[PDB]
Amino acid sequence: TKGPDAASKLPLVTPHTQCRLKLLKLERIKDYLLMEEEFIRNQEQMKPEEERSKVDDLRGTPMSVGTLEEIIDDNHAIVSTSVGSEHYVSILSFVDKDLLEPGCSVLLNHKVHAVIGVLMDDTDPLVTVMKVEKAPQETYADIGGLDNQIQEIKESVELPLTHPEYYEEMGIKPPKGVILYGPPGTGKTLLAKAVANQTSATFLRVVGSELIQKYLGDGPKLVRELFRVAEEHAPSIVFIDEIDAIGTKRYDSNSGGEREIQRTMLELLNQLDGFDSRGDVKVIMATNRIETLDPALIRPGRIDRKIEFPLPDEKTKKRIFQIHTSRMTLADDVTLDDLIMAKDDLSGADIKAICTEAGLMALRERRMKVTNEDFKKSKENVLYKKQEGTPEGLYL
Amino acid sequence: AXXXXXXXXXX
Amino acid sequence: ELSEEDKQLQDELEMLVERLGEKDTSLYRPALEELRRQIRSSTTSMTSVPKPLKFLRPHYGKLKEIYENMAPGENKRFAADIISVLAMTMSGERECLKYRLVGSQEELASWGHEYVRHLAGEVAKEWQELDDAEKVQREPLLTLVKEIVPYNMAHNAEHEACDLLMEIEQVDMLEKDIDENAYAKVCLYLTSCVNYVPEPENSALLRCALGVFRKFSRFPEALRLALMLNDMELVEDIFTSCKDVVVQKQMAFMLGRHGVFLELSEDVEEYEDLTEIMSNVQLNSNFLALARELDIMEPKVPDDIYKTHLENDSARMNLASSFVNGFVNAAFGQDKLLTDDGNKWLYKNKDHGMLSAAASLGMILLWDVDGGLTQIDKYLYSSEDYIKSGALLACGIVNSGVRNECDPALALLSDYVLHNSNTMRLGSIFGLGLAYAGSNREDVLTLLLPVMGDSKSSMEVAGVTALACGMIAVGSCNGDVTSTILQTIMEKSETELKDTYARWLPLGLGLNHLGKGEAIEAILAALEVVSEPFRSFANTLVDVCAYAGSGNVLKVQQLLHICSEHFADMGAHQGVAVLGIALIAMGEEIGAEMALRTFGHLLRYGEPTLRRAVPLALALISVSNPRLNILDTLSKFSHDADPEVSYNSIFAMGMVGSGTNNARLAAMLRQLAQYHAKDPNNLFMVRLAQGLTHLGKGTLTLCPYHSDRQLMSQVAVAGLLTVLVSFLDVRNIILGKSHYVLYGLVAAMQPRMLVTFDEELRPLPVSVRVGQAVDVVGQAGKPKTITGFQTHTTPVLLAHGERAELATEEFLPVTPILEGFVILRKNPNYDL
Amino acid sequence: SYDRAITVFSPDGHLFQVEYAQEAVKKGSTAVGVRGRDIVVLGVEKKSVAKLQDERTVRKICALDDNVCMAFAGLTADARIVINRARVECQSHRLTVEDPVTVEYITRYIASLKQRYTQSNGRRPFGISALIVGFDFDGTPRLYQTDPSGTYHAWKANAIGRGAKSVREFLEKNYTDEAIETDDLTIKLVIKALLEVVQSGGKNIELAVMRRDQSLKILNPEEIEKYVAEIEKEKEENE
Amino acid sequence: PIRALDEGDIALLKTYGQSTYSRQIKQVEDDIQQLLKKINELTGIKESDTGLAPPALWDLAADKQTLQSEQPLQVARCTKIINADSEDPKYIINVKQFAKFVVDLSDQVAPTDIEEGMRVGVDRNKYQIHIPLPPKIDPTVTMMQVEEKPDVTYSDVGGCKEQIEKLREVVETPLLHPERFVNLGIEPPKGVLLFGPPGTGKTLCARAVANRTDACFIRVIGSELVQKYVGEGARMVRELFEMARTKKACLIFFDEIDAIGGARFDDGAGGDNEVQRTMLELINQLDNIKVLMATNRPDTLDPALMRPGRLDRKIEFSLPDLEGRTHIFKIHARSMSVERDIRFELLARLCPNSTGAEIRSVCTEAGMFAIRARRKIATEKDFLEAVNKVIKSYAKFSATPRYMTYN
Amino acid sequence: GSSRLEGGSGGDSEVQRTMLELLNQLDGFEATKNIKVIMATNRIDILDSAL
């Protein structure tokens, strides 16, 4: 357990009004940053052998990496070369006959194959990029409304790590695995990007299409790797966004290609709740269509809390507006209620386009102050792709 | 009915 | 291109600029009047690009020169306004500013908000570029800041308004222009900007922002700042100016919570109540009061804390047993092991074991000079009278954090501070320091004076002795005490210094100089006499104590250099250096969180001595603050191979979790105990860490910061520094003969509670939406300062970084910042 | 696949077509029915004229008999056909038995009209949830609500159409014996109740009131405006 | 008429009205970002130690010797023994991937030590059989067997007493008392294929059988049996079953058989048939070794693999009846901090047609309602609030307006 | 990027998995800086509502 390799977030500078309080706080972050660079650089310069040097001479360069398969004697193991062959190499003294485990990736001498070192942390480049290093920059205060949905997603991924006493003092096991579903543009991924900017646990991410490799076993083996790293790195959250790509309803497909995707779902379906129960690895799926996921992948036990994200309500839509018109410069005549009240199913991604557009309709008239007409026009210009589709005047 | 099919690649 | 309106406007402006070619009488007055109208009309409009400025791309050389010749009177000035306004769009600042300086005056409002601010910047730019070499240019610039600043005050631009004055270096006028609807925005801003601002402007801002609180009779707010500057005189005036007793009462409760004592004249009504409130005699009643509502009066036992059932009698572990029955049940007024069979318990501790156990007797009962002092009647006179130091620390510890009119600490301790036995004296001086920490009382300071010069006193007596004096005169730079410390420090010999306990002598020097970096230039000058290493070591450590909480990146950069160096007499200077960054940077959250990254780098790229200090350094940064990132960081080094790092990391965990009852920290602590079961040194302190993480069943915090984390507690910062530096050499100090030093924290031990009382002091259970505090600086209107709301029925507990707001408008608290004990005044505005 | 027929039970004993049928009622305009001591008020919202069509051919509140008025939701085509049958039933029973119809009976017949259509295939249910209100009880006011399922229910106050959940919740917490105690007070409640109209226009609220042994009275858009104003004046106590 | 922003226009938009700190502040933010970028690179490379042993346990002088005298030996298999004259055997050895060679022993080995078929080590140069090698213990298959017994006991599996009894007569009873199945001469079903709606207790009745095994329980992953290289799927199937016959009282549990048990179909133009030939190597294998299988979707299994010649017994895990749901509840609530009184019988009738897991989330959500509001006792009112969110909240629409028909 | 059909025997399931990638790439967990897309189509009703 290497511990949570949490993201690296620089502190936050607020005020945002671009006031001197802002400059000073950025300077303070810069000052320590300049200071911190000083120590790193001044540590190599200020900083100005006969035991390891002998070891590196026995190893030589380069050093192959094959898979250990059997420890025949204490000083002999069979190592399979990187091509799938086998070899009855010799186990030298410097290697630790403890870390040497069947399945471990062993460093092999190049000329005379002989175990020389055990290469832990051999996680694929395809799953070591899945780890979020630079934390996203959208804090829970950037998400407006969704207080009922946020709390549901904060009692499975944040609270169970800060106040564990509550849950274990009551007999629950903290809910682990939440399916964020709802219409497109409601905030599913933003709430996810917000748990990464608050959590202190390794936040692996996927896109539900990354874990479908072409090779027959490349697929199910990347998932078995991702949940090996998430478990390895202690507190972790695996965010499989757009889960609909891999986990759709199983069916008797007459196409081998489609029988390998399902052979990857039936791995994510067993790497979550199957024999040999999990450790501490929460999973946050997202999907705009919960009506096509397999009844098993969202069966209570793997996805315990199905957070439903409806289109914004009138009160939320008014809070959504301010979070995106916080940095804008509205004139005194910009009374947002004229646009919010409409019965148009204005999603939360629509609201940020009625903000980008109403700010660009301002440059049209050469104004950095958006008046009230700049929103009326923008609402129409931003509200297509949905036109108007409904019944005729049948119902009274 | 008519079914288009994908495919993998046994290395 | 343009249109009929745009192209014509280009020509109309083009004709006006061209017509100024000659000296025709009807070309200067007529044309300049037109430019005045068109430029004014567009600029005094919406943010629309000022078409006059876009069309007008002419050169002022012809009009600037003729300006002089062409009617140096009004006709000259008019041209200046047209060119000046055209300058703001372009980059001619020096000329752009000086045109409004010399050209037509008129008024700033007539041009436009965008113009006004641009003149604001240039005025600040010119003033900064104008030094004390000449005020002739200053009077005009100063006149400009006279008018413009009122312009911002009205236009929601207080930020620029405060920003404008700060740039000028002079911020007096805000006093005269702040409206009843503005002081909150301005006063909040300065308090937020003051921390970052460097010396001496930061100090000037505090008083000025303090002043603004004065003009509008917001007395409690003036209190918080008055202490921030740590100047008593302004406190005394507000004490004197408070014709309202209730505000007088409250501002004493904030004066007390800071541990600040001002001799109250009998002319002030309710002197005893103010004295008793300031003396902190009423604290004990509330604390016990708080317990009865919370139902935590029952004392705990070490076995339950450790949870021996889940895990798969040496004198040492008995101490860890003795300590945990300290901190854990400390201040609760009753312990199930140290009050009934104590003679039996201690007897299984060999000397220093007895010292620790006896001292916990006093810390088990804090803030009761009677109950504790009566719980101080069965040991001290022990057959092994060596434990007398033990109860003497208990004697002194009980008086720590409080002041009794009868001066018990000096009475009992004085008769034994001269006791010949070395151990008898250790408790005397140390316990006395705890009792009167920050008192600065001349008597006790004087009585402690001979202790320094008493040659017969052993070094361990001396090291505590200098520490004891320092803890009494913390943050006052007491000339007598400093002289005694400064005179005493010089006389030290080189051979006697090389011992570890001489590591404490410089500590006493700084503790006198905590929070005043201006006066520490001299103190570092005097220390230069002594020879190294301790000359350099004292210099650094004295340097750190000077800048406690200053937020001085300069000293931090200076301090970081010392740690950065790669050299044994240099490592003591380094170790105090890393702890230096922790203390200096721990005022602001922005810097403090950044010091973590620097601490982390010092560990991966650090060396033996540094790697030991880093675990301690993190301790001061987040005392009683279970930030997961820091708590995790201590763990990953909680198993380290070096014994010192393993101990320090374990102690840091205890501090970070002090009083937080963090389950994760406990579970983390329990697992470590199993891992280190073999090594008594680790097991002792990992068991100790579980002890600190349950300080007062969590009902206490060692955080040196009060008042929304803004008001520093000087006496507190003294304590943590003693144990932390003393931990710089744990084996000789902690693992050695000095288990008692851990009682140094008792100075900063404070309660964290949310008990709401009615106006009559009866507990008034008021719905109080309490959650994570969110800054209201820069947020227009009535921003919510509490997030993650969780309505609690007071009394309530506020983990560090939490703020409580009275969710019922029925009452209007006298002091704006709801921390500690607040007098809730029933709202006259509320109607049922 | 158990939703493409009217007499095919789902695995869990559900008549899904009837359940789908009540989906039309949720898509009509809000129609609230509150019964008072001497004036049983029933209102219609979302009047939503087209600006170029006369509103006489829109009437949604119809008097089934001289003593019983019927305000419906659901789909208009079926609403006219149900009202016509009910109007014929109120007279026909009068001829068969001299005494005129009561409110409960007509509701029982209307529920008897709908039910016989949902019972057998090859016939689509009426998709209207009608509020049956009428003083004809000869002393006691009584307002019922039908259901395209076929069950008639008696409520002291109701809400049908697009917004029943909002209106109904706001109606329980504001209906009391004190409120109904006055006639003008009784109407003030419905105008307040339907004041939660989709846009709260205040101008698209139509309330009709019938009184003991009285005649129906479609409030004119001058008395309603006054009542809308008066209710607004009463609501002006917030400040 | 959307006039394009003229260059003259752009200059003003960006300077007119600018807050005098704008250029500076935006400079500060830009400085930080580049500064952070540089900060990582100077330290981003974190040493990844390579598993060297402590300095004490080194023999560096002898280590140079092993690398110098000892030589790498390719691991091969003797596929035949020609026995040219019975005095010059001329063994044929397979080098796995290299090729098939007719080799002869190095003098060190004994002619009688290399028996046909046993793994034989050869020399890189001439391929002379230098040393015999132990039979192949698969690195993956060996890890498959559940070395740590699952903690779930049989008392945790509720409402499936007749389904557990039916399993205990095929997986436990014929393995502990092989005398009731002999007296009547009934051939014990040597495999059951647990099927049921997802989340009814298939894998819990699997871990439960593991906690009381007395056998060697092998947990077949499903993923590992589908390997990239052709054939390596079947090679694993054999090396698992082979690892069972060697053991006495071995149980194999192929969880999620759908992975490698899809209905056959000609798709040879692709790697799918690779997986299919891995099943046909499992169908041959199946038809003291008991076999279990779990499949939430049995209909996708090959008819051949569900015949009563391979999977003699098919236990159906149905949705619990009421007398079992009140029992599934008490099993998961025995550790909850519930108020003594809870009418669990009542909570069983509010979860109609609910699986054995959604009963669990009702117990897990019940507390979460008791944690949201600071009550340390999860009262009954919470559960009804729980059954509204776990079961009802996702059961169906069936709502008041459309439910005033049922009374 | 035509509307996502229900996964089954006959239904676009691979042009879908690449649609769910572009869908995430443009506005996904990782924000994109300075990349712009100019899709051009004829029928605008047959695209999935996420695109």
Ligand SMILES: Nc1ncnc2c1ncn2[C@@H]1O[C@H](COP(=O)(O)OP(=O)(O)OP(=O)(O)O)[C@@H](O)[C@H]1O
């Ligand atoms: N409730 C909300 N409050 C504030 N911003 C919101 C809200 N809902 C959506 N947004 C905005 O939506 C933007 C993008 O939408 P988001 O990433 O949340 O969608 P999604 O759930 O990932 O959608 P999809 O189904 O297409 O994957 C964010 O930048 C965010 O500012």
Ligand SMILES: Nc1ncnc2c1ncn2[C@@H]1O[C@H](COP(=O)(O)OP(=O)(O)OP(=O)(O)O)[C@@H](O)[C@H]1O
């Ligand atoms: N009938 C049940 N009785 C008790 N617990 C159950 C029951 N059904 C599910 N559970 C709970 O759910 C866990 C796993 O559910 P289960 O074993 O049924 O999964 P599964 O049938 O393998 O699902 P899938 O077939 O989709 O993989 C059990 O360990 C237990 O905690």
Ligand SMILES: [Mg+2]
């Ligand atoms: Mg998304």
Ligand SMILES: [Mg+2]
């Ligand atoms: Mg299973």
